[PDB]
Amino acid sequence: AXXXXXG
Amino acid sequence: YRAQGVKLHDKHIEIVVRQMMKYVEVTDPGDSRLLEGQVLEKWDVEALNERLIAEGK
Amino acid sequence: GRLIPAGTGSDFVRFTQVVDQKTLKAIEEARKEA
Amino acid sequence: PQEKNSLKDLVYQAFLRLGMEKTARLLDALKYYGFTFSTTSGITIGIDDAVIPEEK
Amino acid sequence: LDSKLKAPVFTVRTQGREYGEFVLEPLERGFGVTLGNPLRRILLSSIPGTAVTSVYIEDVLHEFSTIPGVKEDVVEIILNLKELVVRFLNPSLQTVTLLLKAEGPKEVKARDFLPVADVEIMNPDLHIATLEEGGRLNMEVRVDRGVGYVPAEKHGIKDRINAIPVDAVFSPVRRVAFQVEDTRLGQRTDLDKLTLRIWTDGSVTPLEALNQAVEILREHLTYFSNP
Amino acid sequence: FNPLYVMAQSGARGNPQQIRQLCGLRGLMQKPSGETFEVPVRSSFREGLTVLEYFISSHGARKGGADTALRTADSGYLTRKLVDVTHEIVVREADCGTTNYISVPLFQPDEVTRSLRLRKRADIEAGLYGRVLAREVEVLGVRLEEGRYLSMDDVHLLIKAAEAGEIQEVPVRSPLTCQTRYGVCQKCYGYDLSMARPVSIGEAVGIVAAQSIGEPGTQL
Amino acid sequence: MEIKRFGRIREVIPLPPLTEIQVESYRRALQADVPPEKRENVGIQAAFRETFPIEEGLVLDFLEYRLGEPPFPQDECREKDLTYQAPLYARLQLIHKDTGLIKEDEVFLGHIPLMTEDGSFIINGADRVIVSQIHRSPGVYFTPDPARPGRYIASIIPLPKRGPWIDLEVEPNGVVSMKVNKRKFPLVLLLRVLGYDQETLARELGAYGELVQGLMDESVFAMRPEEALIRLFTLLRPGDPPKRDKAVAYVYGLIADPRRYDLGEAGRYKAEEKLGIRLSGRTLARFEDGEFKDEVFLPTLRYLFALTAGVPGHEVDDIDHLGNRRIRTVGELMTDQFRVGLARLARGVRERMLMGSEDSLTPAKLVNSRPLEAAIREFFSRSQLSQFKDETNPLSSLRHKRRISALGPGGLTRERAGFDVRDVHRTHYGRICPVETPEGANIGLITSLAAYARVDELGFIRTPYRRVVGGVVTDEVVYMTATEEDRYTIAQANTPLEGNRIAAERVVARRKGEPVIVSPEEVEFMDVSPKQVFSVNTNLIPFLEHDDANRALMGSNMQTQAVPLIRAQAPVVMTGLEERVVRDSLAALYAEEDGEVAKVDGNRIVVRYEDGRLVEYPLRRFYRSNQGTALDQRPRVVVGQRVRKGDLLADGPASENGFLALGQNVLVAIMPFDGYNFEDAIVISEELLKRDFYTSIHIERYEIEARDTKLGPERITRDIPHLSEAALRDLDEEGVVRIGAEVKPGDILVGRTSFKGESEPTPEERLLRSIFGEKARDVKDTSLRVPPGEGGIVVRTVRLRRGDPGVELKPGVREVVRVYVAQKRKLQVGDKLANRHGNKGVVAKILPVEDMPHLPDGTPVDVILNPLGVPSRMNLGQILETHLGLAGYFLGQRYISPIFDGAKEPEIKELLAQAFEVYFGKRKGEGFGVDKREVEVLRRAEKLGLVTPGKTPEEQLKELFLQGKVVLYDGRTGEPIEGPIVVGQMFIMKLYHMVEDKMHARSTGPYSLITQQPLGGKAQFGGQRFGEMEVWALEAYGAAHTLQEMLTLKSDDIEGRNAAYEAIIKGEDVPEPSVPESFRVLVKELQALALDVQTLDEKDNPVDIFEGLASK
Amino acid sequence: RVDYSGRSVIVVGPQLKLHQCGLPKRMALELFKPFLLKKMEEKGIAPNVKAARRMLERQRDIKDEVWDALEEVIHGKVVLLNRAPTLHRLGIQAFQPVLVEGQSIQLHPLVCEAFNADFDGDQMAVHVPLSSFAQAEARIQMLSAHNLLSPASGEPLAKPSRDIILGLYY
Amino acid sequence: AEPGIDKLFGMVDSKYRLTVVVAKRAQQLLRHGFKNTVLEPEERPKMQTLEGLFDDPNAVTWAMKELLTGRLVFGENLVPEDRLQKEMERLYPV
DNA sequence: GCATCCGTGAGTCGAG
DNA sequence: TATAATGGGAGCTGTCACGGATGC
Ligand SMILES: [Mg+2]
Ligand SMILES: [Mg+2]
Ligand SMILES: [Zn+2]
């Protein structure tokens, strides 16, 4: 889902 | 920026601020074609005024 | 899509010329002839 | 000891005195030896490496 | 599956008797460090050389004393004595004692040492000490053949009561560096390129050092032969 | 030689707060309303948190995450506005010949209003560095000439001078006072900071400025 | 192997069915098992009851409905690209009022999608999931006015698309205002419409002095309910004729009409509880005996005034409270769209009723099912809540079904979404996981249902607790909403118990979320488990209490992305939840009853039960999921094996003996390695590839159509012009590649020829033709080829043709051919690995085994993780996991370490001691003492204060081993690492982000139509976007020619790009750029806006960029 | 959107010199493709350009010598690496490509800070400047090793970090 | 870094002029097939192939090295353009 | 002179 | 190509901050 790629 | 520990030179901010001051508002038109309250570039009004002063207007 | 007026596209640097001593001399003689 | 600041200063001063080519070589050298020594340094993290002080 | 390829070419770059660079490529994957490390270990520890193992100076008790008439202390002289490069001309010779006696204003060099049969001094312009007016230096130095590095307390040799034991730097090899870089031959992309860099004192050249080093290793490989 | 300590001190990884949360304690935590919750988390990450503690920290974690995620867009917008306003500014000439300049203060009124205190080293650096002197400065028996590009050593010198009471302010060429049309000149700009030397004519200064201001934007 | 589990907390109840939120919802909506007369007024039945009867004199009425059996099974629907669905019939009767004639018939309304056993749908062959929505629960709310303090807003909110929000506000001028459809008007008017006398409003609102005076207007009371009604109608409808029946119609439809205005059942309940009243219907008023009667308005006004005055027992509302936010599940959403389509069908019905012949009209002639069908289909296709199911691993599906979204129709948009709604409300406890949410733009908007959480019939999320009476904790479990939970003092689940009694002088509890220390006498309830606080994913992270929440989020999210591995293993350290996940996800196959196994096959397992019956289970084998991950079931039993009930028959994807297997258990050393692990990069051993660790099967599907054209038919054939036999080598007679063949990029999967577009051959072509004397063929090679960067073994071919039995394609299509290609993917450089603690990294290096750090016994490590990733990240769970992992390596055992009831340091130390004895004593008996290198490392560690001076080498090595550290040898040297290194077993997964999928490059390729710029995306063979910011970079560098190339030569300058390509293949430097085509597009698009854009020279003379082509 | 561009996952480059990046073989084969056709014609590898291209069409048709041809093609040349978001000008930097096996781009450690790039799964785009001019700008102005210091603060933007500092300190 | 980049930057009043010079010079080398080079046979930049060291195909590398030798003249308005073109065409045909 | 209306903005690749 | 037929029908409601144009 974005930020540094969790999702 | 300092608060967050970001070292950044005054120059850049100065460039931006310079662009922010880029304009002026006419208080009196004098002998020109301009109007009261007309917004224009400082460079343009200065060039105009140097032409008028050179002309004696 | 024009070349921007900055860096290598600056009017200050973009008309610059490069020539070798051989060709420079030859052209200098081409001038010295006429 | 060499830490982030002293190394940064080293890089800057090296830029000033020796120029960017030599500074680049320096940078790569520092890189190489840094990685090399970091490998065999014995640096690791165990649960006992977070040391709770008795003062707490 | 099928693998057949050519033996590597050994490349040599040498400047004087002091330094050399040695390149071996291509090598199979990993063999760069397989050859490099043992050689580095051998080159540093096992290469035969000479060193100053003991020093006696007139009117000098211990190492940290000073010498009236001389500016350098006993410590500084011993240091210079470590940088002395002595080459034995004959294989039979094990140990020598070199005598030096000088006075008056002078700057003593390594050349000033009284010559001995089959003993060559590689660095005669090496500066041992400076003597002032009234300055008197009378000393004997013990030079032995050995390998690697022995601290003074480990050999602890004394010919007399005032003799000061010196850290013995035997190794003619001052430094060894090696680096492996990935290289490619055709479609083989994992191959190794071995580069060796050897600094010596000139008594034994880098190429001689490497040759002596690889021989020691090969000889050690023969030890797996007869149980 | 403790790994956490070495990594922290060297600048390799970690700050004191994180190391603290690992060893000493997790600390005070935030309610969703933004007010700080009375009872703190007495557990470090080594000892492990209680379910309730974890959940209490969750509010702060979420607040921070949303902060980041929603920060990127506003930062980006700011950058685009800056680029659009500065884009025409380039170094179009060596000198505009202006006699105008600005004076960078080496001192600022104290918070108590009592007196003037020396400005922080980094602040003075960020205002004086790579600048061209608008006027002659004589300090500590050293002559810093008009037209000189102040090096870092020149800056440190001027700071020493200020500490010695010799100079309270430094006259300097600045984009603020530059008369170059559609841009700035070389002397008024000073150093290309990347090259630690005077700026090359043709350098697009506006874009560099906008990017220099914009890039840190998501750290705010 | 032995599974040892820690923790003292005994969970009273198991996890509820995890897919129940989907399953029971949809089942409730359909009521297929309920005989029609026994059906309730909820669901699609509700929609039928709201739509019908249809009047205006013909009357169409609704009797009942029925759902038939699905025409095709789920699998067949997946293959044929069909929708799993049941035919929906509705029994209707037309009744002519005057005639008395009644014509009754059962009409076919089309199909409705059936939910599968696992809670998903099959739409056009693809599996989809309808995600639950979260929104503001309908009811009456009171919120602080942001502008003027002391004043409040009373909002009356119905269900979405159920009619207008109504606001009530006390104006600065003193009069109470009502807002409807953005219209502010005095409330007293509507009050008069409801038939309120000034005396009644005075006696009712008199208790509040200042306000009711502002309510009083005599001009309104001087009117009549009729006159007031018409006045209000003129206020809400300017210009619209104020007819009496029309005003009645409008006001009824706005307020009292149950079909137009609907508060939910939940809205009804909440309004009742808040306003302290009783609602008759679900509307705000009624039409009874000819006039209107009030329901909600007066109680709302009363409460509003009471709150404004300061009267006790009146509070504002927290709209983020989970008592005020409810969930719309699959059933409600589908039912909503059903209601809409039904309404449209009704409109059509009234149409036909007016137009059709009066003598004969059947319900069949009146009803066109099409609009309804369209509504349903639209919902299951183009809705934002209808999402492509994530099947990557079973946990992905299970988690997807449990998702909650604040977005979608009737929901938030990311612009309207501020910090408040994205916050973790205290009421999320036990309901919505505080941990698992996306990192980016959707953060807090897309959340996950907690493990023990349940959605009630009203749509509110409920969490279980346990009754505590007199300090005694019962086994009685009570599910409460947040509102109910707020009424109690609830003890933590870890409060010490002896038997069923709490023993502590002081216990930690919550009162309305507030942490409080209370005596056992004060404890009303107690938590079921720490598990209930988090989601199913977060519950899979062992030592969670040791990990910062931010990385727990990442571990959670990343577990979803785990690829099923052929060799897949359950974690060495589990949380205890690993089996329930496999079971609920319907991944594994289980034994129905106690019995004996008759037959075991790769394709089949036949079981004989107590009934004597022979039940045969087919195993799904190498099936392709939505994400292309291979889903296959393998038999875990053998012939003759006795199986009890609920025993494992077969392991599905990512399942090892019934335990969830998301990755491998690898032996890690935590050290820096030569910069190859720099910045989260990871170093692995080639030994992992050798033994096929992190190898996964992926299946890709290719598809081609041969259709009828006007130039002649396309056809699938083996005859392909200008192609050798080398290219047709693997093609069968019909032109389709044969099963078992290996395909690489450029290879033909399916041969196809298409008739050439009409063209007169250029003189070059004609001359070349005559020179080579070969007739120009009238067909060209359109064949489907393996795209760049892809390939594998062809495992399947499907061929459907027009004229074939049971096969009808879309119009014009002669035939369709699919080719399924499987590939076995080894782990490679650039592949993404992660652990459950949020430690993620891309593999940067694969070393041969001899280069790997190794233990003194000659055992090389599998993976090297950089310690620099730990401190700033603050996830220590992975370290503990490693330590325990070390113990279980040498003891050969696996552990269950429940979250927050864990394994603790001392216990791990014990296990590590035993393990050390195993790891060392063996050596001591083998005739080897302590190594020299071990001595040196011991000296080093002794300086670090790791071991105590004076102890023997063995004692010190044990001292280190208890710290989870061991001596490690550099494989490249043989000299030991100077410090002792942390080494142990860690569970690491291979994520769905794989460089093989992401690697793309292009020189030239297809261009866009209008802009003539390169297409985007790998699949289209597209170019990378050089955007405004990249342009800014080039500008900042002052690189003008690089930039100008980006803008012209490399993108939309036609002449430029052509001439550039030719120049480069020739070896000439690239020609000067020209006008980018999109500028011409800009000029012509501005001309279409009637603006003249002129390119001029310095002479101010026009310049033609269209080169005369645009000028007459 | 532009031609002669690509993208892939990034991987740490520790053996790389500051001015270099690892570039996957196939990416390079595609990005430099016309040059490669030309160089294939300059040698006996193909009769002509079209023959060379038809040869590069199928993956099984290509041989050993084409890779050496590609090696000669890229010699001295640089490619532009870029990572989004590009916040300042150092979001794009120029590197000499070194052909590597595998599908990942290799990035130099010292430039990571400037790209805000790390090894957790970041991707980067490659672009090939075509003209002598573009190439000259890329090598003189945009070369990684030619920008050491921050255009913003004037302080070094390429500096020891993480493991490097760790070892040197140690 | 490019060899002797600091000296190269030292040669010009603006770095972008160095770029313009190098680029134009390289195009000159390409057009005339490196026949106009000011580099002596042993100063020729080499590329290492499978067979042996050959001429570096890269005209920019060349141009920079040539610039370093000092044998190149750069500036504005040295010669009329087509005159330079035609004279180089005479001395070094293509 | 000041409330309130309307219009218009609100990050980049990637894939879909 | 002829009975007569005579004013429609959904809204979509949780951002925000600004700037500039009308209204007390
Ligand atoms: Mg190798
Ligand atoms: Mg990253
Ligand atoms: Zn100026």
SS3 G460: coil
Point out the residue nearest to K15 (C-alpha to C1').
Answer: G416
Helices (H), strands (E): how many in chain I?
4, 3
What is the DSSP code (8-state) at residue G698?
E
Written in H, E and C, the secondary structure of G1052-1091 is: CCHHHHHHHHHHHHHCCCCCCCCCCHHHHHHHHHHHCCCC
CA G304 remoteness from chain centre:
40
Residue type at C32?
K
Helices (H), strands (E): how many in chain B?
2, 2
* Cβ contacts of I53 within 8 Å, gap of 6 or more: I46, I47
Q: Which of G563, G560, G535 is nearest to G549 (CA)?
A: G535
Length of chain I: 94
CB H164 within 8 A of CB D35: yes
Q: How was this structure determined?
A: X-ray
Classify domain G1-6+662-694+827-991 by CATH number: 2.40.270.10
Residue type at E111?
R
What is the whole-number distance in angstroms between the Cα of residue G554 and the centre of ligand 2? 12
Using CA atoms, how far residue G75 sits from C32, G95, G111, G699, in Å, is 92, 44, 18, 17
CB G354 within 8 A of CB G320: no
CATH of the domain at I20: 3.90.940.10
b/e per residue E106-119 (b: at least 16 CB within 10 A): eebbbebbeebeeb
Tell me how many domains chain I contains.
1
* Cβ contacts of G455 within 8 Å, gap of 6 or more: G21, G25, G132, G327, G329, G449, G461, G462
* Alpha helices (H) in chain H, listed in sequence order: 25-31, 33-42, 49-57, 64-73, 109-115, 132-140, 163-169
Maximum separation of any 2 CA atoms in chain H, in Å:
60
Helices (H), strands (E): how many in chain E?
4, 14
CB contact under 8 A, H166 and D27: no
CA distance E165 to E194: 40
CA distance G1046 to H86: 16
Which structure tokens are listed for F48?
């492990």
Kind and range of the H or E element at H160?
Answer: none
The answer to whether F201 faces chain I, any CB pair under 8 Å, is yes
Chains with ≥3 CB–CB distances under 8 Å to G: A, C, D, E, F, H, I
Written in H, E and C, the secondary structure of G381-399 is: HHCCCEEECCCCCHHHHHH
Residue type at G915?
A
Full domain range(s) for residue I29 = 1-94
Chain F to chain G, count of Cβ pairs less than 8 Å apart? 128
CA distance G1056 to G1076: 9
Which structure tokens are listed for G57?
């004199």
CA dihedral G862, G866, G870, G873 (to 10 degrees): -110
Using CA atoms, how far residue F164 sits from F121, F160, F161, G841, in Å, is 15, 6, 5, 54
Q: Give CA angle at G834 (A2, G130), nearest 5°.
A: 50
Q: Please identify among residues 1003-1032 of chain G the ones whose CB lies closer than 8 Å to any CB of chain A.
A: none
Using CA atoms, how far residue G908 sits from D51, F46, G6, G878, in Å, is 18, 14, 11, 14
In chain E the domains, ranked by start, together with CATH numbers, are 1-48+171-224 (3.30.1360.10), 49-170 (2.170.120.12)
Which of the residues I6, I7, I18 would you substitute to probe the D interface, choosing the one with the greatest number of D C-beta atoms within 10 Å? I6
Distance from CA of E187 to the nearest CA of H (A): 7
CA distance C14 to C8: 6
Q: Which of G911, G910, G880, G894 is nearest to G574 (CA)?
A: G894
What is the DSSP code (8-state) at residue F56?
H
Give the Cβ contact number of residue G892 at 10 Å.
Answer: 10
Tell me: is residue H120 an annotated ligand-binding position: yes
The secondary structure of G134-187 as a DSSP string is EEEPSEEEEEE-SSSTT-EEEEEE-STTSS--EEEEE-TTS-EEEEESS-EEEH
* Alpha helices (H) in G800-931, listed in sequence order: 877-891, 905-925
The residues facing F93 across adjacent strands are F185
CA distance G424 to G406: 13
b/e per residue H4-17 (b: at least 16 CB within 10 A): bbbbbbbbbbbbbb
* Cβ contacts of G210 within 8 Å, gap of 6 or more: none
CA distance G293 to G275: 17
Question: What is the sign, positive or negative, of the torsion defined by CA atoms of B34, B35, B39, B45?
Answer: positive
Q: Are G and D close enough to touch, i.e. 3+ CB pairs under 8 angstroms?
A: yes
Q: Which residue has the tokens 């000067």?
A: G1072
Residue type at E185?
L
Which structure tokens are listed for G677?
């692990």
Q: Determine the residue of chain E that is closest to G848 in CA distance.
A: E30
CA dihedral B20, B21, B25, B29 (to 10 degrees): -140
What is the DSSP code (8-state) at residue G850?
G
Q: Which of E16, E6, E50, E22 is nearest to E202 (CA)?
A: E16
SS3 C34: coil
CB G928 within 8 A of CB G977: no
CB contact under 8 A, I9 and F202: no
SS3 B35: coil
Kind and range of the H or E element at I30?
Answer: helix I15-31
Which structure tokens are listed for G1002?
């292009």
Nearest ligand atom owner, CA of E183 = 1
The secondary structure of E172-185 as a DSSP string is SEEEEEEEEEEEEE
Residue type at D17?
R
CB B41 within 8 A of CB B24: yes
Outline where DSSP puts E strands in G553-640.
Answer: 573-574, 589-590, 595-600, 604-609, 614-618, 623-624, 630-631, 634-635
CB E29 within 8 A of CB E209: no
CB G94 within 8 A of CB G357: no
Phi first, then psi, for residue G634 (nearest 5°) are -120, 140
Residue type at G248?
V
Residue type at G1005?
G
SS3 G660: strand
Q: How far from each other are the two terminal CA atoms of chain E, in whole angstroms?
A: 36
* Cβ contacts of G1093 within 8 Å, gap of 6 or more: G1082, G1083, G1086, G1087
CA dihedral G579, G584, G589, G595 (to 10 degrees): 80
SS3 H146: helix
Distance from CA of G877 to the nearest CA of D (A): 9
Q: Which of E4, E49, E77 is nearest to E148 (CA)?
A: E49
Residue type at E147?
V
CB A6 within 8 A of CB G438: yes
SS3 F23: coil
Domain covering G695-826: architecture: Beta Barrel (2.40)
Give the Cβ contact number of residue E226 at 10 Å.
Answer: 5
Using CA atoms, how far residue G569 sits from G541, G620, G699, G986, G1104, in Å, is 16, 20, 21, 12, 70
Which of the residues G668, G982, G983 would you substitute to probe the D interface, choosing the one with the greatest number of D C-beta atoms within 10 Å? G982
Phi first, then psi, for residue G997 (nearest 5°) are -80, -30
Q: Which residue has the tokens 């010695």?
A: F164
Point out the residue nearest to J13 (C-alpha to C1').
Answer: H84
Q: How far from each other are the two terminal CA atoms of chain C, in whole angstroms?
A: 43
CB F27 within 8 A of CB F33: no
CB G132 within 8 A of CB G328: yes
* Cβ contacts of G120 within 8 Å, gap of 6 or more: G22, G127, G128, G129, G389, G397, G401
SS3 C5: coil
Using CA atoms, how far residue G705 sits from B26, G675, G719, G783, G813, in Å, is 71, 51, 16, 10, 7
CATH superfamily of G138-317: RNA polymerase Rpb2, domain 2 (3.90.1110.10)
Residue type at C28?
E
Which structure tokens are listed for F18?
């994180």
The answer to whether H102 faces chain G, any CB pair under 8 Å, is yes
Q: Which of F5, F4, F64 is nearest to F32 (CA)?
A: F64
Q: Which of G124, G26, G133 is nearest to G82 (CA)?
A: G124
Q: Determine the residue of chain F that is closest to C9 in CA distance.
A: F202
The secondary structure of E88-129 as a DSSP string is ESSSS--EEEEEEEEESSEEEEGGGSPP-TTEEES-TT-EEE
CB I91 within 8 A of CB I36: yes
Which structure tokens are listed for G51?
């739509």
What is the DSSP code (8-state) at residue G836?
T
CA distance E99 to E97: 7
Residue type at G818?
R
Q: How far from each other are the two terminal CA atoms of chain D, in whole angstroms?
A: 29
Domain residue ranges in chain G: 1-6+662-694+827-991, 16-137+318-463+529-587, 138-317, 464-528, 588-652, 695-826
CA distance G186 to C2: 63
Q: Give CA angle at G53 (G49, G57), nearest 5°.
A: 180
Classify domain G464-528 by CATH number: 2.30.150.10
CA distance E173 to G388: 69
Phi first, then psi, for residue G455 (nearest 5°) are -100, 120
Kind and range of the H or E element at G475?
Answer: strand G472-480
Chains with ≥3 CB–CB distances under 8 Å to C: F, G, H, I
CA distance F127 to F105: 9
Residue type at E123?
N
Q: Which residue has the tokens 């460090």?
A: E33
Give the Cβ contact number of residue G564 at 10 Å.
Answer: 26
The resolution in Å comes to: 2.8
* Domain spanning G588-652, CATH class: mainly beta
SS3 H66: helix
CA distance H6 to H27: 7
What is the DSSP code (8-state) at residue F217?
G
CA distance G1032 to F80: 10
Q: Which residue has the tokens 């909650």?
A: G404
Q: Which of G1098, G1074, G1071, G1094 is nearest to G1084 (CA)?
A: G1094
Kind and range of the H or E element at G14?
Answer: none
Give the Cβ contact number of residue G727 at 10 Å.
Answer: 18
SS3 E139: strand
Kind and range of the H or E element at G527?
Answer: strand G525-527
Q: Determine the residue of chain G that is closest to H37 in CA distance.
A: G1065
* Cβ contacts of G113 within 8 Å, gap of 6 or more: G83, G84, G85, G121, G122, G123, G334, G376, G380
Q: Which of H4, H2, H9, H35 is nearest to H107 (CA)?
A: H9
Give the Cβ contact number of residue H108 at 10 Å.
Answer: 28
Which structure tokens are listed for G50?
């709201």
Residue type at G560?
T
Give the Cβ contact number of residue A3 at 10 Å.
Answer: 19
CB G604 within 8 A of CB G619: yes
CB F24 within 8 A of CB D53: yes
